[PDB]
């Protein structure tokens, strides 16, 4: 089984214990660790923060303790113009420059592959994403002739049906990608004016217009579209989404004034790290959607949709039952990486739980 874990650049700036460096990563935890994100500059892949060169170095040393560990660098990501990738990919002179520049960069800093996190192409962009993936793989193949182990190429593909249809030629790209991480955790957000869970695993017959907004449907859809199971990776979140409530209505369908207040460490409206959620649970009322199989907690006028060890294990069994390639975690730095907030004196509770299901019968 594969266990793809993202590590985020900006998590070094969080104060106190919230601060996370490659250092904190247990090298035998995941099979692949992906670093997010890289920039594109002068049509070439390039670093993002000032000190990336040093963190790349810290992260890649983990490989001294575990030689079977593969690491990848991710270009793109949400706080990066979708328009910017579209510009690079539609013009042939720009795309080849981007492509030619990647193997050198990855070899210098010691990465084993590239991850395309273009989020996300509109309908005019679909043929260009395909070309990007095809020509990039071809470059990775040509570069391997020099005697090095072939660079890996993966992509983070969104999970909403409409998003997939609009801009991904899933049957085409699967032939060339090594794995595809399915972002099965953005099924709800402040944008809806009601409370709801962002990563239900199953349909759950409470609402019947979004029969498409759960990991189960997304995985089936990707499979019907031609993505082989041994290349598909299910994304499991390690964060929670919060909402400020606009009444005392706390049940399914309750109304919303907007995102929840920020957490002490992550400082981001509508998001909480699992370690912040462990602190939040004290004096909160836990609840759990039985059909959808995921929990939510609420306290005061805050309402939080999140994942715990039971839900994450359940999702893990699901992927195994459908014989998928593995699980993908976003992100190691929102998990209880020190292991001192969530009770048990275990570190990376959520990720170790996922691994437990993947490592057994
Ligand atoms: C696989 C996949 O595709 N997954 C997606 C994923 O996109 C989704 O997660 C979200 O992604 C975006 C980025 O794409 C994240 O946005 C974060 O937001 C951070 C906090 O608000 C912000 O942190 C700031 O980072 C700055 C660096 O750009 C820091 O500036 C630095 O300040 C330092 C002192 O503090 C100083 O020393 C540095 O020199 C200075 N350097 C700079 C500016 O480079 C800043 O301090 C820091 N702190 C603040 C302001 O709070 C990040 O910059 C920003 N990222 C990027 C790349 O810009 C967002 O947080 C992600 N969300 C979550 C929940 O993790 C994800 C969720 O859905 O999964 C998939 O969808
Ligand atoms: C990344 O590249 C852009 C465009 O080339 C450049 O203007 C910018 O300074 C870089 N952005 C960051 C956040 O480092």
XYZ file of C-alpha atoms and ligand atoms in Angstrom:
446
model
C 0.000 0.000 0.000
C 1.067 3.586 -0.682
C 0.814 6.326 1.954
C 1.301 9.777 0.380
C 1.858 12.543 2.942
C 1.969 16.234 2.146
C 4.114 18.590 4.181
C 3.412 22.325 3.835
C 6.044 25.088 3.434
C 4.356 27.751 5.502
C 3.862 25.598 8.607
C 7.315 26.658 9.847
C 5.936 30.118 10.676
C 3.289 28.906 13.101
C 4.126 29.924 16.671
C 4.997 27.795 19.648
C 4.420 24.069 19.385
C 2.454 24.708 16.210
C 5.785 25.140 14.400
C 6.696 22.214 12.132
C 9.902 21.407 10.198
C 10.689 18.288 7.998
C 12.549 17.231 11.168
C 9.410 16.251 12.980
C 8.501 13.737 10.306
C 8.855 10.074 11.319
C 10.675 8.620 8.275
C 9.001 5.187 8.453
C 5.499 6.632 8.640
C 4.710 7.359 4.983
C 5.935 5.767 1.762
C 6.065 9.094 -0.055
C 6.348 12.596 1.384
C 5.385 15.489 -0.855
C 6.585 19.039 -0.323
C 4.208 21.874 -1.145
C 4.573 24.044 -3.027
C 7.025 25.245 -5.628
C 6.784 28.373 -7.746
C 7.148 28.868 -11.458
C 9.381 31.792 -12.470
C 10.817 32.807 -15.843
C 8.794 29.794 -16.999
C 10.961 27.527 -14.824
C 10.255 25.651 -11.601
C 11.774 27.448 -8.690
C 11.695 27.652 -4.857
C 8.915 29.462 -2.925
C 10.055 30.572 0.554
C 13.518 32.066 1.206
C 14.759 28.985 3.007
C 13.268 26.227 0.827
C 16.784 25.096 -0.210
C 17.423 24.320 3.422
C 14.084 22.581 4.174
C 14.400 20.468 0.971
C 17.712 19.417 2.420
C 16.226 18.633 5.847
C 13.378 16.647 4.296
C 15.576 14.698 1.941
C 17.964 13.580 4.700
C 15.089 11.544 6.171
C 16.107 9.223 3.361
C 19.320 8.391 5.264
C 17.334 6.571 7.917
C 14.861 5.046 5.453
C 16.230 4.375 1.934
C 12.882 3.125 0.600
C 11.295 6.596 1.217
C 10.456 8.529 -1.977
C 9.967 12.313 -1.825
C 8.300 14.638 -4.376
C 8.005 18.393 -4.909
C 4.563 19.841 -5.744
C 4.032 22.771 -8.195
C 0.805 24.735 -8.104
C -1.606 24.598 -5.167
C -4.636 26.820 -4.360
C -2.805 30.151 -3.487
C -1.318 30.053 -6.959
C -3.012 31.473 -10.065
C -4.884 28.850 -12.093
C -4.454 31.366 -14.865
C -0.683 31.179 -14.408
C -0.528 27.437 -15.210
C -2.913 27.960 -18.135
C -0.473 30.527 -19.569
C 2.463 28.147 -19.253
C 0.584 25.156 -20.689
C -1.212 26.537 -23.823
C 1.860 28.102 -25.473
C 4.371 25.548 -26.766
C 7.483 27.708 -26.189
C 6.548 28.208 -22.514
C 5.600 24.624 -21.711
C 8.814 23.062 -23.070
C 10.874 25.580 -21.077
C 8.983 24.580 -17.909
C 9.390 20.885 -18.717
C 13.140 21.012 -19.578
C 13.759 22.795 -16.285
C 12.313 20.182 -13.922
C 14.647 17.162 -13.980
C 17.702 19.393 -13.297
C 15.975 21.056 -10.318
C 14.729 17.790 -8.768
C 18.161 16.114 -9.142
C 19.956 19.107 -7.562
C 17.758 19.141 -4.455
C 17.299 15.381 -4.343
C 13.585 14.832 -5.028
C 12.380 11.602 -6.609
C 9.488 13.085 -8.575
C 7.145 15.966 -9.366
C 3.514 16.439 -8.311
C 1.190 18.567 -10.435
C -1.291 20.423 -8.264
C -3.066 22.534 -10.861
C -6.295 23.541 -9.327
C -8.016 23.748 -11.444
C -8.357 23.805 -15.121
C -11.420 25.235 -16.730
C -12.966 23.659 -19.775
C -10.679 25.487 -22.224
C -7.677 24.044 -20.336
C -8.401 20.275 -20.473
C -6.423 19.524 -23.675
C -3.509 21.567 -22.344
C -3.370 19.613 -19.044
C -3.196 16.434 -21.086
C -0.325 17.775 -23.206
C 1.465 18.969 -20.051
C 1.215 15.534 -18.488
C 2.186 13.684 -21.702
C 5.220 15.774 -22.609
C 6.376 15.922 -18.964
C 6.297 12.148 -18.588
C 8.132 11.774 -21.898
C 10.866 14.070 -20.548
C 11.141 12.004 -17.385
C 11.515 8.886 -19.561
C 14.146 10.478 -21.814
C 16.086 11.723 -18.768
C 16.261 8.207 -17.271
C 18.389 6.955 -20.188
C 21.341 8.707 -18.501
C 21.368 6.033 -15.796
C 19.275 7.540 -12.973
C 16.104 5.935 -11.557
C 13.113 7.374 -13.448
C 11.506 10.428 -11.859
C 7.954 9.875 -10.657
C 5.095 12.028 -11.846
C 1.833 12.432 -9.992
C -1.120 14.806 -9.935
C -3.655 16.024 -7.380
C -7.065 15.708 -8.935
C -10.119 17.366 -7.400
C -13.216 15.311 -6.417
C -16.373 17.187 -7.405
C -17.993 15.652 -10.478
C -18.428 18.980 -12.289
C -14.746 19.830 -11.676
C -13.596 16.524 -13.106
C -15.761 16.737 -16.190
C -14.811 20.327 -16.932
C -11.135 19.828 -17.024
C -9.566 16.435 -16.635
C -9.234 13.807 -19.297
C -8.870 11.141 -16.693
C -8.618 8.265 -19.212
C -5.805 10.098 -21.011
C -3.765 11.253 -18.009
C -3.837 7.950 -16.043
C -1.751 6.310 -18.746
C 1.087 8.722 -17.995
C 0.800 9.465 -14.274
C 2.344 7.219 -11.618
C -0.467 7.963 -9.136
C -3.419 10.343 -8.798
C -4.395 11.735 -5.427
C -8.147 12.330 -5.215
C -8.888 15.429 -3.106
C -11.879 13.853 -1.345
C -12.263 16.575 1.316
C -13.683 19.743 -0.224
C -17.345 18.703 -0.512
C -18.554 21.602 1.665
C -17.275 24.990 2.767
C -18.267 28.464 3.899
C -19.594 29.125 0.368
C -22.736 27.147 1.139
C -24.939 29.053 3.518
C -25.585 25.914 5.613
C -23.690 23.598 7.965
C -22.494 20.294 6.449
C -19.512 17.906 6.346
C -16.696 18.318 3.844
C -15.567 14.691 3.748
C -18.493 12.327 4.200
C -17.491 8.827 3.095
C -20.972 7.744 2.020
C -24.043 9.400 0.517
C -26.226 9.479 3.620
C -29.863 9.973 2.633
C -30.540 13.341 4.337
C -29.879 15.500 1.278
C -30.643 14.246 -2.265
C -29.271 16.755 -4.827
C -25.669 16.204 -4.039
C -25.579 12.516 -4.419
C -22.171 13.313 -5.811
C -20.488 14.852 -2.843
C -18.874 11.999 -0.973
C -15.695 9.956 -1.343
C -17.630 6.859 -2.366
C -19.163 8.452 -5.433
C -15.922 10.221 -6.415
C -13.930 6.981 -6.254
C -16.558 5.147 -8.319
C -16.660 7.927 -10.895
C -12.881 7.989 -11.316
C -12.987 4.228 -11.760
C -15.748 4.396 -14.414
C -13.716 7.050 -16.165
C -10.775 4.667 -16.617
C -8.396 5.547 -13.811
C -7.018 2.130 -12.780
C -7.443 1.301 -9.091
C -3.730 0.575 -8.659
C -3.012 4.239 -9.549
C -5.798 5.921 -7.625
C -5.074 7.333 -4.140
C -7.821 8.504 -1.771
C -7.254 11.784 0.042
C -8.039 11.797 3.727
C -7.934 15.071 5.652
C -6.267 15.684 8.911
C -7.862 19.103 9.434
C -11.405 20.192 10.129
C -13.578 22.961 8.774
C -15.249 25.309 11.199
C -18.293 27.528 10.857
C -19.787 30.328 12.940
C -23.467 29.494 13.555
C -26.201 32.043 12.801
C -28.764 30.691 15.314
C -29.040 28.023 18.001
C -29.807 25.477 15.271
C -27.014 22.903 15.509
C -28.428 19.985 13.429
C -28.121 18.869 9.805
C -29.045 21.878 7.656
C -28.512 24.505 10.393
C -27.709 28.060 9.091
C -24.322 29.830 8.925
C -23.059 33.396 9.448
C -19.670 32.440 7.968
C -16.337 30.619 8.745
C -15.401 29.698 12.328
C -13.001 31.831 14.385
C -9.314 31.104 13.733
C -7.289 28.600 15.718
C -4.512 29.687 18.080
C -1.817 28.089 15.918
C -3.051 27.772 12.309
C -4.612 31.285 12.186
C -6.941 30.778 9.207
C -10.725 31.476 9.120
C -12.711 28.233 8.663
C -9.854 25.766 9.246
C -8.490 23.941 12.335
C -5.586 21.530 12.677
C -6.420 18.227 14.351
C -4.290 19.254 17.325
C -6.366 22.419 17.700
C -9.506 20.243 17.419
C -8.277 18.053 20.247
C -8.103 21.163 22.413
C -11.520 22.380 21.143
C -13.305 19.123 22.025
C -13.055 19.788 25.796
C -16.514 21.008 26.749
C -17.905 20.584 23.249
C -20.661 18.233 22.221
C -19.461 15.509 19.932
C -21.938 14.201 17.345
C -21.568 11.730 14.477
C -23.467 11.425 11.165
C -24.351 7.722 11.103
C -25.011 7.400 7.340
C -22.068 9.570 6.195
C -19.794 8.085 8.913
C -17.928 11.186 10.020
C -18.132 13.318 13.178
C -18.797 16.953 14.019
C -18.508 18.846 17.248
C -20.093 22.059 18.415
C -19.599 24.488 21.277
C -20.875 28.047 21.776
C -21.589 29.379 18.314
C -18.769 27.347 16.759
C -19.510 24.235 14.700
C -16.685 22.017 13.468
C -16.783 19.214 10.858
C -13.743 17.000 11.309
C -12.132 13.502 11.165
C -10.945 11.311 14.076
C -9.300 7.888 14.401
C -12.567 6.021 13.830
C -13.526 7.902 10.650
C -10.022 7.864 9.172
C -9.743 4.046 9.789
C -13.132 3.630 8.171
C -12.054 5.526 5.094
C -8.896 3.442 5.041
C -10.872 0.177 5.095
C -12.969 1.556 2.296
C -10.005 2.120 -0.004
C -8.685 -1.332 0.743
C -12.002 -2.936 0.020
C -12.047 -1.272 -3.382
C -8.383 -2.251 -3.876
C -7.078 1.274 -4.448
C -3.325 1.992 -4.473
C -3.324 3.720 -1.090
C -4.243 6.787 0.950
C -3.047 10.427 0.747
C -2.878 12.657 3.828
C -3.275 16.385 3.858
C -1.212 17.275 5.696
C 1.306 15.924 8.184
C 1.621 19.327 9.883
C -2.075 19.625 10.792
C -1.983 16.169 12.403
C -0.817 15.930 16.028
C 2.828 15.805 14.963
C 4.374 16.334 18.428
C 1.787 14.035 19.989
C 1.029 16.106 23.065
C -2.399 17.667 22.355
C -4.610 14.680 21.682
C -4.422 12.675 24.909
C -2.663 9.432 23.963
C 1.097 9.832 24.020
C 1.217 8.857 20.346
C 2.542 11.085 17.590
C 0.708 11.570 14.238
C -2.393 9.861 15.659
C -4.414 10.277 12.488
C -1.711 9.138 10.097
C -0.618 6.212 12.271
C -4.279 5.063 12.381
C -4.514 5.169 8.584
C -1.273 3.157 8.315
C -2.557 0.568 10.805
C -5.412 -0.395 8.509
C -3.164 -0.348 5.463
C -0.537 -2.475 7.255
C -2.866 -5.287 8.281
C -5.053 -8.124 6.952
C -2.503 18.549 -2.643
C -3.306 19.786 -2.816
O -3.326 20.312 -3.924
N -3.921 20.232 -1.721
C -4.807 21.393 -1.648
C -4.341 22.660 -0.871
O -4.131 23.755 -1.745
C -5.305 23.112 0.250
O -4.653 23.805 1.334
C -4.470 25.279 1.228
O -3.481 25.769 0.306
C -3.085 27.142 0.446
C -1.884 27.376 -0.471
O -2.125 26.880 -1.775
C -2.751 27.568 1.909
O -2.580 28.987 2.037
C -1.544 29.292 2.999
O -2.050 30.106 4.047
C -1.098 30.364 5.086
C -1.705 30.941 6.387
O -2.753 31.861 6.136
C 0.041 31.229 4.535
O 0.984 31.244 5.574
C 1.792 32.394 5.402
O 2.833 32.052 4.517
C 3.632 33.152 4.147
C 4.592 32.684 3.068
O 4.018 32.899 1.773
C 4.337 33.657 5.382
O 5.126 34.789 5.052
C 6.349 34.660 5.754
O 6.230 35.232 7.032
C 7.288 34.814 7.871
C 7.013 35.326 9.273
O 5.744 34.825 9.668
C 8.606 35.306 7.277
O 9.778 34.797 7.923
C 8.745 34.817 5.869
O 9.985 35.341 5.425
C 7.554 35.214 5.013
N 7.794 34.649 3.687
C 6.964 34.565 2.642
C 5.827 35.535 2.633
O 7.132 33.753 1.735
C 3.315 34.056 6.422
O 3.998 34.444 7.609
C 2.417 32.865 6.709
N 1.503 33.142 7.821
C 0.319 33.762 7.840
C 0.216 35.052 7.086
O -0.634 33.299 8.454
C 0.631 30.530 3.299
O 1.528 31.375 2.620
C -0.386 29.995 2.283
N 0.304 29.101 1.352
C 0.872 29.526 0.210
C 1.558 28.503 -0.660
O 0.866 30.707 -0.154
C -3.805 27.051 2.910
O -3.463 27.195 4.284
C -4.094 25.582 2.680
N -5.181 25.170 3.553
C -5.068 24.268 4.533
C -6.340 24.000 5.289
O -4.023 23.674 4.823
C -5.834 21.932 1.087
C -7.090 22.294 1.898
O -8.261 22.129 1.129
O -5.938 20.680 0.406
C -6.006 20.702 -1.015
O -7.206 21.277 -1.497
C 6.872 33.471 -7.576
O 7.043 33.845 -8.947
C 6.330 35.024 -9.293
C 6.110 35.101 -10.807
O 7.321 34.722 -11.429
C 7.110 36.187 -8.681
O 6.661 37.468 -9.130
C 6.953 36.055 -7.147
O 7.811 36.981 -6.463
C 7.122 34.617 -6.578
N 6.196 34.550 -5.456
C 6.507 34.310 -4.152
C 5.340 34.330 -3.192
O 7.634 34.059 -3.686
